[PDB]
Amino acid sequence: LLDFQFHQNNDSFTLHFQQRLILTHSKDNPCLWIGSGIADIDMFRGNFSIKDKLQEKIALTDAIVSQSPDGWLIHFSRGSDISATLNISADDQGRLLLELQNDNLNHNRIWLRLAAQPEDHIYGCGEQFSYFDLRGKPFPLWTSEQGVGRNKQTYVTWQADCKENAGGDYYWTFFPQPTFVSTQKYYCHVDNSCYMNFDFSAPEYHELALWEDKATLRFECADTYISLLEKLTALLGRQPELPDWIYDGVTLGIQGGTEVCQKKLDTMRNAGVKVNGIWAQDWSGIRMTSFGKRVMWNWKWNSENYPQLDSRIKQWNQEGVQFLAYINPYVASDKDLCEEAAQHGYLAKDASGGDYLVEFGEFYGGVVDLTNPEAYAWFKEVIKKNMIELGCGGWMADFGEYLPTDTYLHNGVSAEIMHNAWPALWAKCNYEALEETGKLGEILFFMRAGSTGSQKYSTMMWAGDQNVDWSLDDGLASVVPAALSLAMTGHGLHHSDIGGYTTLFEMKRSKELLLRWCDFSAFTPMMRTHEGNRPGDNWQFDGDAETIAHFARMTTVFTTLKPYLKEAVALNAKSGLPVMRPLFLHYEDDAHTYTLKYQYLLGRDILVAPVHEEGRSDWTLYLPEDNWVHAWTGEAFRGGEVTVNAPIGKPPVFYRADSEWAALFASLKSILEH
Ligand SMILES: [Ca+2]
Secondary structure, three states: OEEEEEEOOOOEEEEEEOOEEEEEEOOOOOOEEEEEEEEEEEOHHHOOEEEEEEEEEEEOOEEEEEEOOOOEEEEEEOOOOOEEEEEEEEOOOOOEEEEEEEOOOOOOEEEEEEEOOOOOOEEEEEOOOOOOOOOOOEEEEOOOOOOOOOOOOOHHHHHHHHHHOOOOOOOOOOOEEEEEEEOOOEEEEEOOOOOEEEEOOOOOEEEEEEOOOEEEEEEEEOOOHHHHHHHHHHHHOOOOOOOHHHHHOEEEEOOOOHHHHHHHHHHHHHOOOOEEEEEOHHHHOEEEEOOEEEEOOOOOOOOOOOOOHHHHHHHHHHOOOEEEEEEOOEEEOOOHHHHHHHHOOOEOEOOOOOEOEEEOOOOEEEEEOOOOHHHHHHHHHHHHHHHHOOOOOEEEEOOOOOOOOOOEOOOOOOHHHHHHHHHHHHHHHHHHHHHHOOOOOOOEEEEOOOOOOHHHHOOOEEOOOOEOOOOOOOOHHHHHHHHHHHHOOOOOOEEOEEOOOEOOOOOOOOHHHHHHHHHHHOOOOOOEEOOOOOHHHOOOOOOOHHHHHHHHHHHHHHHHOHHHHHHHHHHHHHHOOOOEEOHHHOOOOOHHHHHOOOOEEEOOOEEEOOOOOOOOOEEEEEEOOOOEEEOOOOOEEOOEEEEEEOOOOOOOEEEEOOOOOHHHHHHHHHHHOO
16 A cells, blocks of 8 residues: 545645555644755864754645646645645655655755654664664764764763864764664665755654755565565665685785785784785875875875785785775875876866865865766776776775865766765776676775765775774774664675774774774674774784784684675675674564664674673673574573673674584584684
8 A cells, every 4th residue: 555645624644655654744743844044064174064054944834635647746835935845656666755846946954754653763874883773863964074982971082073073973974874774664765965864863753854955755665674675775786795705814904015015914824814815005105294194195006115016916816815905086186196187177176166175184185076977987997907907806995975065066966965975976986997897796895985876886885993992982882883774774794994993192902902803803794904093003913922813713713604604795695685684683573682782693693792892701792582502612592681701712602503504603613622
């Protein structure tokens, strides 16, 4: 059913869709307000402060129906100079389609309420780092820097705020998305890319605010969450299968040239670490600033830093070791590529008509205009010729979240609209470089920024910048909700920097933190380290023999899991069943599973609850009702809350005794105890 009942007498109605109550509207309780405002934006180098100067907000209490071909058309109004229309219909696959159009452009605000029940939980909205269940809070959806500390009640957040509004808050992300899942077992997806605010705080309704004069929303229902994700991914996209070599060990994050890479590779391999790769973000050079060292933003191998890299890649490849690089969608203004781009009008413009230059702290970057058809093809050629043809097995494809809101773009669309759409456009560029060279399934790139479409075009998500700390909102813990939220928004391939990244204000990565994070990432689809922004302040993967031996232990764990991970990843590609899974995908009747944030299922059969606090010798977690086996002792466990010993190297991990993979999981204890 698509069940729509109007009562013309008092301009009131309801809409059910497959029995779900979606809209209710009366004169005393409207579902639609329109109005106008002026965006008050201060960029803070991507740490956006974005507040409305609200001018009007008007409830449209009058409503008249008429019937169009595909379904119903409601003409909402309030007096004669204030109106909008809502078309209700079903699209080609049977999804409820809502099309809102305000009277005129000057009415650039919309507020739509959807009926809800008090008990409903809400998941998704892209990649969320403080909350997984969203119910109870509002969520602005504006891609930005993710924040350093992210909580106004922690010290580092206060310091970062003092410096460049860089502290952030609970909702800050580089991959927000106007898409969510309800426990009435539907999803809602909004097409628009304007600023939005999705407010899940009221018991009886969700309120969706859009900063635009029009809106399109789509909904679809299903009988299970698994089936709901199959259907969401059919709309948004499915990721490819990962290259077979991802499963063969850890990718070492290393800076300092060819020699330094070779040495550390040998140190780790000789101590029995399983190593599948080298990731070297300084492949293109180093820039010295007052603010510290940086990567040189010109996407061409620097043989003065990385002598004989061309030939050394071949040798590494012949020994089962890929080489991975770094690119982002800006080009340094003092260097070749930005020069070539200005000469062909490949850059975004400013108001004065010049080429837009972004200040990054003692250098500028030009903004490659991905809306310019021929700039897009040119930058794609840069990736082909300077990375793929060089023999790179992959790279970090960084940024996407800081298109400045006063750029002027070739397609003529406001930067206030293109800003949120930038990341998936950047993803597609990368994706098509691979497509056009036959390299899908063979080369792997990974991204932090995302948007609608990243579900198709980004081959892997990375959780971006965590602090080198144990905080909930920006530490090790914050990665879990990030993976689970994305899972619920149709992206099922997710990893993090082993040890975290952000080293500021006296934060330093300890040995303990590196090792705990190693334990976590051994139970995700990819292991990759990062030196951090200040390398010498942090404990590194080769810091001492015990550390090296720990990596040997845990990369053995990870490589043993290979064929199980590979099946999960095939299932992700085939039907949107994500690799890190909220517990309620398989335990739908267990109420306590809907509010978990910091544990997940890896595939169907492994439960993981990573230790996310300093100084722990045990850990408390939840097991749903099943026959569970603790991975390191073989101890049998039933459902319920449990506390287990959890020294480093023996993370809280449990497997299903009835699993067809059970013999592989029992081999972890067996292998490590001989
Ligand atoms: Ca952060």
